[PDB]
A paper describes a structure:
PIKKs are protein kinases that have diverse regulatory functions in transcriptional regulation, DNA repair, cell growth, metabolic control and mRNA surveillance but [name] is the only member that is catalytically inactive, due to loss of the DFG motif within the kinase active site. Although lacking catalytic activity, [name] is critical for coactivator function as it is a direct target for multiple activators and enables the activities of [name] and [name] to be directed at specific genes in order to stimulate their expression. [name] has the domain structure characteristic of PIKK family proteins, consisting of HEAT, FAT, FRB, Kinase and FATC domains arranged sequentially from N- to C- terminus.
The Finger, Ring and Clasp regions lie within the HEAT domain, whereas the Head region contains the FAT, FRB, Kinase and FATC domains. The FATC domain is integral to the kinase domain and is sandwiched between the LBE and the Kinase C-terminal lobe, forming a plug over a large hydrophobic cavity within the kinase domain. The interface is localized to one side of of [name], primarily around the FAT domain at TPR repeats T1-T7 (residues 2572–2830) but also at the C-terminal half of the Ring at repeats H41-H44 (residues 2150–2350), which clearly represent sites of intermolecular contact between [name] and the remaining [name] subunits.
Author numbering:
A (entry chain T): 1 to 159, 214 to 258, 287 to 522, 558 to 648, 676 to 815
B (entry chain T): 1653 to 2016, 2022 to 2043, 2089 to 2107, 2115 to 2130, 2138 to 2146, 2154
C-alpha cells in the first residue's frame, strides 16, 4: 500500500476526471487518502512527473470567476490543497514555467470568490522557488508591480488580497531599489475612503460597505508588515518621516472584529523602534500621546494582546531615556503604576512595569539635578512610585488567606505527582537486603468558578511568586529611597552644626510621605507570614532599607508599630531577627535600644505571670537589648543608666508578687 | 467658597475636609449624622467638583493626597452605607460617582462591602431587592457601560457564589414568587439588544455582551429543569452570537450552546456542524474554550447519536479534518481532542498509523507530553479490548526515545506493558 499496489488501485483517476461536477469525491483521494501518510523511499520522482499531466488537465477547469462553487471554484481551493504539500530536488521548471499562464486569470479582479489562485498558489510557487536559485525572480516580479499599480483602479470602483509577505522575502539581494520600495510606499498615502478623515475630528459605518475597509487595512497593514524586512539589515534613504503618522494612522482605525493582524502589526512596530535612527523622531512627530489604549478598542480580542502592547512601549521609553522632559515621564509613572496595580494583566508584566519604574529614576535625579528650581517635584515624583510598590504588596497581604488555599492544593498535588518517582526501576538494593533477610467559605475564588473561565486554573507556587515579588520590589526599593538623599534642603534652614553627618542620614518629609513610609513598614511586616533564609533576606532588606531614614523620622514609625511587631512576634519567633538587625548593627541603635526598653519597661509590670511563650519572647528581647551595650559601647551607654536600677528593684518587687517568681531573677542574671 | 477663587488648592481643600469628617466619625462611634446621610453626599458632590476641576485645568494631576483621600472618603461613605436599612439606593450613587476616575473598584474600601451582601448569611431576605434594583440599573441605558461591568461583578458574582456555596440554586425560587429578575431577563431576551447585539452608537467597551454571555450561561448550569421555555429563549438569544466576527465571543457563546444541548431540546440541523466547526481549525487565543467545549460536548454526541446513529460519519469529520490540517499545531490540537475523551472512540484503525508518523515528527521540548500520552492512548485501547510494521514504528520509537535521551519513566512503564501483547543489534550504536 506504498508500492505499485497503490497504482493498481487508484486507476479510478487514470483519467483526469470523468463527471467533473463530482471530482471532489472521486479523484480527491490523492493527498486526502494516499499521499499524506505512506512513506518516503524515494518514490515521488517516479509518478509526480506522471501526474503533472493530471495536474494541468485538472487546471483546464478554471474558466470563470463570480460564484460558481460546485464544478469549479471550491475545486480551485482543492487544487490549492493539491499543490501546497510537495517538496523535492528535481524538475522545478514543469511547475514554475507553466503555472503563471494558468494563474494569470485571477489576479486583478477581486469580486465573488476569486483573487486567491495566483496569490495562494504563489505561496507554493514562492517556497518552491526558495529552495533553488534559478534567477528568474526578477523575470516574474513584473505582475506584482502590476498589482500594486492596479490598486488605485480597484479602490476607485469600490468606495484587495495583495498579501505582500510571500513576494519580497526572497532575500536574494541583487534586488532593485525604487520599483520595489515605491511599490511599498505608493500604498501609504491612499485614503481608505475619504469619509474616515471626516470621522477623525472628534476622536480627540458611514461608508456604504465595510468589508472592503477590512480588505484595504489588511493590505496597508501587510505593507507595514513587509518593509521592516526591507529595513532590518537594510539602511534606507530619501524618506524616513512618512512612517510614524502612517503607523498610528494605521493603528487608530483597525476594526474590533479582528486583532490577529494587530499582533505582528505591533511586532512590526517594535522592529521599527528597535533600530537606531528610527527612535528619536517619533517623539518629534507623534509626541507619544497617541500611544494609549486607543490601540486596543476591541477589548475581548485585545485582552490577549495586552502584554505585547505595553512591553514595546515600556522597552521604548527605556530604549530612548534621552531628551525626556519631566511632564512626560511623570505621565509614564502615572500610567505604568496603574499598569502595575491592575491585577488582571499578569505577574511578569507587573514586575516589568516596576523594573521600568526604577530604570527611569537616574533621569529623575539627573533631570532634577540639572535645573534645581523644580527639584522637589522630582522628589514627590520619586515617591509616587514607592507608594505604588506599597500598594502592590499591600494587595498580597489581603490575598493571603486564599494564597495558602492554592498552596495547600499545590503540595497536595505535588505529593500525588512526585510520588511516582519513588517506585522507579533503578533501585538495586531491595533484592539484596531482602536476600540477606532471606538467608538469615470562598472569599476570593469567585473568578475561578465562573462558567467562562477562559484559561486553565493556575497551579504554580503562589509563595514563590510572592517571594519573587518581594525580593524584586524591595530590591529596587533600597536604591530608590537611598537615592532620595540627593534632594534634601541645606542644613542652614535646619540649623544644625553637623554638616557631614547629613547626606546619608537625615532627610525631611511631608505628612503624606511619612504615612506612606509607615504603611510601607506595616504592609511589609505583615508580609512576612508567607515565609527561612528567604524571610531573613527581607528582614535584612527592611532593616537596611530603614537605615537611611532620618532617625527622628524613623522613631515615629517604630514607637507606633513596635507593639504591632510585638503582637506579631508572639506567633512567629523569627521576627526578633528584625529587631536584632536594628540594634546589633546600626547608626541608630542608640535609638532603637531606648525605644525597646521603654516598651519592655511598660510590659514588665506583671509580665512573668503570663505563659511560657511571651515570657520566652520577652526574656529574649531584653537579652537582645543588653547585647547592644557590649558590642558598641562607645555609644550612648547613657541610654541604659536610666531605668536599670528600677529594673533591679522593680524586678524584685514584681517577683515578690508574681506567679512564676524565678523569671525575674533569671532576668537579673542575664543583666 | 475658596475653591473658585484660586483653582489650585483644591487637592489641599478636599483632603482637609475628609480629614475633619473622618475625625468626627471616630469620636461618635454610632454616627454623627444620626445614621441618616445628609453630611456625606455633599462630600460626594465635593469629590465630583474637585475631580472635575482637576480634569479641567493643567498643573497638578495624581497627587499623593488625592490618591489617599479618595480611599478615605470611600471608606467613610461606604462605611455609612452598611449603617442604614435603606441599603440599596446609596450603593449605586457611588457607582454614578466614580464615572470619571477613582479606580475600577478600588477594593476593600468598596468591594469588601459588596461581598457582605453576597449570599451570606444564607437566607437573608434582603439581597433579593439588591438583585432587583441591580437588574433595573443594568438595564438603565443612560449610565456608564463600564459601571455596568461593575454590575457584572455584583450580579454575577453573587449568583455564582450562590451556585458555589449550594448545590445548584437550592435557596431561591419560593414556588417562583417574586424573583423579579428573570422577567428582566425577559427584557434582555425580548429586547435582544437589537439590532447589532450591543448598541450601534460609540460604546468604547465590549463587556456587556460578555456579561449576558455569563449571566445567560449560569442558568444552564443552575436550573436546567424548572422553566425550560425560558431556556429556549436563552437558546435563541445565545445562538445569535455565533454569527459574529471575533473568536472568543464566537467560541464563548458557542461554548455555552455546546454546554446547553447535553441537557435537553436536541436538534440535528445545528448540532452536527456545531461540533464540526469545533473540530475545525481555530487559532491560538481560546484553545482551552475548544478543549472544555468539545470535551464536555462529545459524550452526549455519542449517546444522542445512537438509536439513529449507525454511522461514525461524525467521527469521519475528525478523520478528514485530521487529514486536512497540514500537520502542525493544528493536528496537535486534535490529538488531545481524541485523548481527553478516551473510552468511546473505538471505531477503526485509521487513527493509529498516521498519528504514529506525526508522533515520530514530534521528536525532530514542550511537546513530548503529547507524544508519550499517545502511547498511553493506544495502551488504553488494547487494554480497553482486554498489521505489524506500525507496531515496530511505535515500539521502535519508544526504544529510540529512551535510548536517545518523570515522563521517560512512564514511557518505560508503557513499554513494560506493550511488549507482551530493534531486537539485538541496534543497541550496538549506543558529552
Amino acid at each position: 500500500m506504498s508500492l505499485t499496489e497503490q497504482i493498481e488501485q487508484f486507476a479510478s483517476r487514470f483519467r483526469d476526471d470523468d463527471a467533473t461536477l463530482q471530482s471532489r469525491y472521486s479523484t480527491l483521494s490523492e493527498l486526502y487518502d494516499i499521499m499524506e501518510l505512506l512513506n518516503s523511499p524515494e518514490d515521488y520522482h517516479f509518478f509526480l512527473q506522471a501526474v503533472i499531466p493530471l495536474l494541468l488537465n485538472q487546471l483546464k477547469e478554471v474558466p470563470i470567476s463570480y460564484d460558481a462553487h460546485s464544478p469549479e471554484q471550491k475545486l480551485r481551493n482543492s487544487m490549492l490543497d493539491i499543490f501546497n504539500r510537495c517538496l523535492m530536488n528535481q524538475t522545478f521548471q514543469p511547475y514554475a514555467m507553466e503555472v503563471l499562464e494558468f494563474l494569470l486569470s485571477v489576479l486583478p479582479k477581486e469580486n465573488e470568490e476569486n483573487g486567491i489562485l495566483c496569490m495562494k498558489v504563489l505561496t507554493t510557487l514562492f517556497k518552491s522557488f526558495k529552495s533553488i536559485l534559478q534567477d528568474k525572480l526578477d523575470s516574474f516580479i513584473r505582475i506584482i508591480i502590476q498589482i500594486y499599480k492596479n490598486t488605485p483602479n480597484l479602490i476607485n470602483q469600490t468606495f484587495l488580497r495583495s498579501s505582500m509577505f510571500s513576494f519580497k522575502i526572497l532575500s536574494e539581494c541583487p534586488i532593485t531599489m525604487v520599483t520595489l520600495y515605491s511599490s511599498y510606499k505608493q500604498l501609504t498615502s491612499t485614503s481608505l475612503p475619504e469619509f474616515t478623515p471626516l470621522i477623525m475630528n472628534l476622536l480627540n459605518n458611514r461608508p456604504a460597505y465595510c468589508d472592503f475597509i477590512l480588505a484595504q487595512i489588511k493590505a496597508t497593514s501587510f505593507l507595514a508588515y513587509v518593509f521592516i524586512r526591507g529595513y532590518a539589515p537594510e539602511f534606507l534613504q530619501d524618506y524616513v518621516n512618512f512612517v510614524p503618522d502612517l503607523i498610528i494612522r494605521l493603528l487608530q482605525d483597525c476594526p474590533s472584529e479582528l486583532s490577529s493582524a494587530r499582533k505582528e502589526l505591533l511586532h512590526a512596530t517594535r522592529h521599527i523602534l528597535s533600530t537606531n535612527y528610527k527612535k528619536l523622531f517619533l517623539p518629534k512627530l507623534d509626541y507619544l500621546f497617541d500611544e494609549r489604549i486607543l490601540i486596543g478598542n476591541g477589548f475581548t480580542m485585545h485582552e490577549t494582546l495586552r502584554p505585547l502592547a505595553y512591553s514595546t512601549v515600556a522597552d521604548f521609553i527605556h530604549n530612548i531615556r534621552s531628551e525626556l522632559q519631566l511632564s512626560e515621564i511623570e505621565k509614564t509613572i502615572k500610567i505604568y503604576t496603574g499598569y502595575l496595580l491592575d491585577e488582571s494583566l499578569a505577574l511578569t508584566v507587573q514586575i516589568m512595569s516596576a523594573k521600568l519604574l526604577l530604570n527611569l529614576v537616574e533621569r529623575i535625579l539627573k533631570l532634577g539635578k540639572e535645573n534645581p528650581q523644580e527639584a522637589p517635584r522630582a522628589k514627590k515624583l520619586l515617591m509616587i512610585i514607592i507608594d505604588s510598590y506599597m500598594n502592590r504588596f499591600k494587595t498580597l497581604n489581603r490575598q493571603y488567606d486564599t494564597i495558602m488555599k492554592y498552596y495547600g492544593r499545590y503540595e497536595t498535588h505535588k505529593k500525588e505527582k512526585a510520588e511516582k518517582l519513588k517506585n522507579s526501576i533503578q533501585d538495586n538494593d531491595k533484592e539484596s537486603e531482602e536476600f540477606m533477610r532471606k538467608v538469615l467559605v470562598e472569599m476570593f475564588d469567585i473568578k475561578n468558578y465562573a462558567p467562562i473561565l477562559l484559561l486553565p486554573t493556575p497551579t504554580n507556587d503562589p509563595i514563590k511568586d510572592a517571594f519573587y515579588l518581594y525580593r524584586t520590589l524591595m530590591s529596587f526599593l533600597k536604591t530608590i529611597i537611598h537615592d532620595l538623599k540627593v534632594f534634601n534642603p541645606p542644613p542652614n534652614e535646619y540649623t544644625v552644626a553637623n554638616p557631614k553627618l547629613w547626606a546619608s542620614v537625615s532627610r525631611v518629609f511631608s505628612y503624606e510621605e511619612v504615612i506612606v513610609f509607615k504603611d510601607l513598614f506595616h504592609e511589609c511586616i505583615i508580609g512576612l507570614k508567607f515565609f527561612t533564609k528567604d524571610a531573613r533576606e527581607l528582614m535584612d532588606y527592611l532593616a537596611f532599607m530603614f537605615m537611611q531614614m532620618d532617625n527622628a523620622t524613623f522613631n515615629e514609625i517604630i514607637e507606633q508599630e513596635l507593639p504591632f511587631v510585638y503582637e506579631r512576634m508572639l506567633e512567629d519567633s523569627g521576627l526578633l531577627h528584625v529587631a536584632q538587625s536594628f540594634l546589633t548593627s546600626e547608626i541608630t541603635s542608640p535609638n532603637f535600644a531606648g525605644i525597646l526598653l521603654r516598651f519592655l519597661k511598660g510590659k514588665l509590670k506583671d509580665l512573668g505571670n503570663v505563659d511560657f511563650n511571651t515570657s520566652n519572647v520577652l526574656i529574649r528581647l531584653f537579652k537582645l537589648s543588653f547585647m547592644s551595650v557590649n558590642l558598641f559601647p562607645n555609644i550612648n551607654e547613657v541610654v541604659l543608666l536610666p531605668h536599670l536600677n528600677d529594673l533591679i528593684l522593680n524586678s524584685l518587687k514584681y517577683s515578690t508578687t508574681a506567679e512564676e517568681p524565678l523569671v525575674y531573677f533569671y532576668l537579673i542574671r542575664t543583666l | 467658597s475658596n475653591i473658585p477663587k484660586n483653582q489650585v488648592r483644591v487637592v489641599s481643600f478636599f483632603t482637609n475636609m475628609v480629614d475633619l469628617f473622618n475625625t468626627m466619625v471616630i469620636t461618635n462611634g454610632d454616627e454623627w449624622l444620626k445614621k441618616k446621610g445628609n453630611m456625606i453626599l455633599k462630600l460626594k458632590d465635593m469629590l465630583n467638583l474637585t475631580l472635575k476641576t482637576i480634569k479641567e485645568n493643567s498643573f497638578y494631576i495624581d497627587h499623593l493626597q488625592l490618591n489617599q483621600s479618595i480611599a478615605k472618603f470611600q471608606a467613610l461613605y461606604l462605611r455609612f452605607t452598611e449603617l442604614s436599612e435603606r441599603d440599596q439606593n446609596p450603593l449605586l450613587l457611588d457607582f454614578i460617582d466614580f464615572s470619571f476616575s477613582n479606580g475600577i473598584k478600588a477594593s476593600y474600601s468598596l468591594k469588601k462591602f459588596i461581598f457582605h451582601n453576597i449570599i451570606a448569611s444564607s437566607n437573608k431576605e434582603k439581597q433579593n431587592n439588591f438583585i432587583n434594583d441591580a437588574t433595573l440599573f443594568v438595564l438603565s441605558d443612560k449610565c456608564l457601560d463600564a459601571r455596568i461591568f461593575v454590575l457584572k461583578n455584583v450580579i454575577n458574582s453573587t449568583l455564582i457564589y450562590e451556585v458555589a456555596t449550594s448545590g445548584s440554586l437550592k435557596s431561591y425560587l419560593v414556588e417562583d414568587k417574586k424573583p423579579k429578575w428573570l422577567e428582566l431577563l425577559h427584557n434582555k431576551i425580548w429586547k435582544n439588544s437589537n439590532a447589532i447585539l450591543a448598541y450601534d452608537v460609540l460604546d468604547h467597551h465590549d463587556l456587556f455582551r460578555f456579561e449576558l454571555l455569563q449571566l445567560s450561561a449560569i442558568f444552564i448550569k443552575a436550573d436546567p429543569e424548572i422553566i425550560a421555555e425560558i431556556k429556549k429563549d436563552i437558546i435563541k438569544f445565545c445562538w445569535n452570537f455565533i454569527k459574529l466576527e471575533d473568536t472568543l465571543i464566537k467560541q464563548s457563546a458557542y461554548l455555552v450552546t455546546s454546554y446547553f444541548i447535553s441537557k435537553f431540546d436536541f436538534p440535528i440541523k445545528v448540532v452536527t456542524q456545531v461540533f464540526v466547526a469545533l473540530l475545525r481549525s481555530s487559532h491560538v487565543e481560546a484553545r482551552y474554550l475548544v478543549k472544555q467545549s468539545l470535551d464536555v460536548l462529545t459524550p452526549v454526541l455519542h449517546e444522542r447519536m445512537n438509536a439513529a446513529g449507525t454511522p461514525d460519519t461524525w467521527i469521519n469529520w475528525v478523520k478528514r479534518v485530521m487529514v486536512e490540517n497540514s500537520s502542525s499545531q493544528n493536528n496537535i490540537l486534535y490529538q488531545f481532542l481524541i485523548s481527553h475523551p478516551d473510552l468511546f472512540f473505538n471505531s477503526r484503525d485509521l487513527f493509529i498509523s498516521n498519528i504514529i508518523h506525526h508522533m515520530n515528527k514530534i521528536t525532530f521540548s514542550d511537546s513530548h507530553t503529547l507524544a508519550i500520552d499517545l502511547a498511553s492512548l493506544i495502551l488504553y485501547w488494547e487494554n480497553k479490548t482486554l498489521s505489524l510494521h506500525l507496531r515496530e514504528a511505535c515500539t521502535a520509537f519508544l526504544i529510540r526515545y529512551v535510548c536517545a535521551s518523570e515522563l521517560g519513566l512512564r514511557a518505560i512503564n508503557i513499554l513494560s506493558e506493550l511488549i507482551s501483547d530493534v531486537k539485538l543489534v541496534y543497541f550496538e550504536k549506543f558529552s
